[PDB]
């Protein structure tokens, strides 16, 4: 209930604010990091295995086992997300309905593969995979026409998963490929 | 009397009370991380940091955590226990942690001794090889106490609040503009 001046150093909880991210470091084995628009990532230690229950799945280590196939029925990602909702006791908020199944956007696989496997991402091809983050690049090209503001939040996420396992990416942002400005 | 040179002691105790290595008592109620002792003074081998948080509602602060940096080893005294953070690969400056009465006592082979009552009181002791080679909120240990208020930019001021506000660790921490009563 009180506004904190950052950094905040209480002996179980560190809350600090850069120009880019807001970090929260807890002794319970939790680390949150959020640029203040859209990207949110969480890190838990190996103590919480078989206990987590959020929209991030459980933390058993098994690929798609108990998140989507609970009792033999395969849950779609739209009905997996509506199960994770929180009821607020004043506001009624409508769940998003099933859109009609679009075409699998395979006419832009050449552009996502050329862009994301550039020379700047050399020492992370063995750390993080290619197939999930290129699949997510498929919808960002055909659901976001015109300006390129959806394709450079996925390769910006590829260069954050690169630099979290331990690797070091290079500079890919040119003057025509999603530039960023800072004063001085 | 015989003329040998003894160890020197800095104190941090209660709601923001200090005694420097040369014996100067002052009060500073800051809310940030502060340099207590270091020898990175204008290259260096240790650093001891104190983490002062508000304890009460009146605006006074007390010390609740100690971070000890020795080379590349980082200890941390927090929640009535010592925690080892980042033990280096093959250097490992020889330290020792044991419990003597109600206090926890860290000692180092290089001459650095930290004594902690597990709440708010800290005693730092340095071997007499560190004469005139340290700085921070504990002074500079040269047996002359009218220069213990040297700031981070090597300026002797007369204020308790211009000296103590210059040893904060983060630039976005606020300045203490008065001492509470
Ligand atoms: C008490 O001080 C002596 C003097 O420095 C320490 O002896 C040093 O120990 C380290 C390794 O433990 C050696 O590398 C140094 O060469 C020693 N110094 C001398 C002059 O020989 C001793 O370790 C300290 N006591 C404790 C318990 O740490
Ligand atoms: C549950 O047990 C451990 C952690 O408690 C975990 O490594 C393991 O994979 C889990 N097994 C199953 C069947 O969920
Ligand atoms: Ca699973
Ligand atoms: Ca002095």
Concatenating the DSSP letter of every residue in chain B gives: ----PPPEEEEEETTTEEE-TT--EEE----SEEEEEES------EEEEEEEEE-SSSS-EEEEEEEEEETTEEEEEETTEEEEE---SS----EEEEEETTEEEEEETTSEEEEE-SSS-EEEEE-TT-TT--BSTT---SS-GGG--B-TTS-B-S-HHHHHTTSBS-TTSPPP-S---
Look at B79 and A6 and tell me if their CB atoms are within 8 Å: no
Interface test with A, best of B170, B174, B176 (most A CBs within 10 A): B170
Look at A11 and B79 and tell me if their CB atoms are within 8 Å: yes
> To which H or E segment does residue A13 belong?
strand A13-17
For residue A42, which of A53, A52, A27, A31 has the smallest C-alpha distance? A31
Tokens 């160890």 map to which residue?
Answer: B7
Pocket of ligand 2 contains residue A179 by CB under 6 Å: no
- For residues A24 and B26, give the distance between their C-alpha atoms in angstroms, rounded to a whole number: 34
- CA distances, A89 to each of A82, B5, B53 (Å): 17, 71, 36
Query: Rg for chain A (alpha carbons), in Å?
Result: 19
Query: Of A6, A11, A27, which is closest to B64 when you measure between CB atoms?
Result: A11
- A87 touching B (Cβ < 8 Å): no
- For residues B60 and B160, give the distance between their C-alpha atoms in angstroms, rounded to a whole number: 15
Contact B12, B139 (CB under 8 A): no
- B174 touching A (Cβ < 8 Å): yes
* Token reading at B127: 């071997």
Q: How far is the CA of B109 from the centre of ligand 1 (A)?
A: 5
Residues 6+ apart with CB under 8 A from A81: A55
* Token reading at B88: 């280096």
Q: Which residues of B touch A27 (CB under 8 A)?
A: 79
Q: Whose CA is nearest to atom 21 of ligand 1?
A: B109
Query: Rg for chain B (alpha carbons), in Å?
Result: 16
- The ligand whose atoms approach the alpha carbon of B21 most closely is 4
- A12 touching B (Cβ < 8 Å): yes
- For residues B3 and A176, give the distance between their C-alpha atoms in angstroms, rounded to a whole number: 74
* Token reading at B103: 């206090």
3-state secondary structure of A74: strand
* Token reading at A43: 């890190």
- For residues B75 and B98, give the distance between their C-alpha atoms in angstroms, rounded to a whole number: 14
Q: Which chain A residue shows the shortest CA-CA distance from B81?
A: A11
Query: Of B53, B172, B174, which is closest to A9 when you measure between CB atoms?
Result: B53
Q: Whose CA is nearest to atom 10 of ligand 2?
A: A60
- For residues A138 and B40, give the distance between their C-alpha atoms in angstroms, rounded to a whole number: 52
Show the CA angle centred on residue B44, arms to residues B39 and B50, nearest 5°.
50
Pocket of ligand 1 contains residue B128 by CB under 6 Å: no
Q: How far is the CA of A69 from the centre of ligand 3 (A)?
A: 10
- Ligand 2 pocket: which of A58, A60, A65, A66 to mutate (most atoms <8 Å of CB)? A60
Angle between helices A155-165 and A131-142 (to 10 degrees): 160
Q: Which chain A residue shows the shortest CA-CA distance from B64?
A: A11
Pocket of ligand 1 contains residue B58 by CB under 6 Å: no
Q: Which residues of A touch B33 (CB under 8 A)?
A: 7, 9
Q: How far is the CA of B31 from the centre of ligand 1 (A)?
A: 37
Q: Which residues of A touch B53 (CB under 8 A)?
A: 9-11
Look at B65 and A12 and tell me if their CB atoms are within 8 Å: no
């Amino acid at each position: 209930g009180a506004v904190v001046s950052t950094p905040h150093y209480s002996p179980g909880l560190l809350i600090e604010k850069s120009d880019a991210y807001t970090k929260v470091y807890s002794r319970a084995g939790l680390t949150l990091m959020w640029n203040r628009e859209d990207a949110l990532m969480l890190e838990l230690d190996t103590k919480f295995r078989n206990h987590t229950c959020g929209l991030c799945g459980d933390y058993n280590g098994l690929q798609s086992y108990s998140e989507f196939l609970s009792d033999g029925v395969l849950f779609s990602p739209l009905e997996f997300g509506n199960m994770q909702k929180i009821n607020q006791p004043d506001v009624v908020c409508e769940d998003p309905e099933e859109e009609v199944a679009p075409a699998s956007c395979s006419e832009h696989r050449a552009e996502c593969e050329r862009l994301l496997t550039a020379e700047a991402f050399a020492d992370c091809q063995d750390l993080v995979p290619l197939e999930p983050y290129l699949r997510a690049c498929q919808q960002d090209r055909c659901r976001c026409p015109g300006g390129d503001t959806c394709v450079c939040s996925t390769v910006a996420e590829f260069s954050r998963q690169c630099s979290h396992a331990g690797g070091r990416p290079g500079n890919w942002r040119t003057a025509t490929l999603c530039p960023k400005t800072c004063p001085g | 009397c015989t003329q040998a040179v003894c160890h020197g002691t800095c104190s941090i105790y209660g709601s923001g009370h200090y005694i420097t290595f040369d014996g100067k008592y002052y009060d500073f109620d800051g809310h940030c991380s502060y340099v207590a002792v270091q020898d990175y003074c204008g290259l260096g081998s240790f650093s001891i940091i104190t983490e002062n948080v508000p304890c009460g509602t009146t605006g006074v602060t007390c010390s609740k955590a100690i971070k000890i940096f020795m080379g590349r080893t980082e200890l941390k005294l927090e929640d009535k226990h010592r925690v080892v953070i980042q033990r280096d690969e093959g250097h490992h400056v020889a330290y020792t942690t044991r419990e003597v009465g109600q206090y926890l006592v860290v000692e180092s082979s290089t001459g650095i001794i930290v004594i902690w009552d597990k709440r708010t009181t800290v005693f730092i002791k340095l071997a007499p090889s560190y004469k005139g080679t340290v700085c921070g909120l504990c002074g500079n240990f040269d047996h002359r106490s009218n220069n213990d208020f040297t700031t981070r930019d090597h300026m002797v001021v007369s204020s308790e609040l211009d000296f103590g506000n210059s040893w904060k660790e983060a630039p976005t921490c606020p300045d203490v503009s008065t001492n509470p009563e």
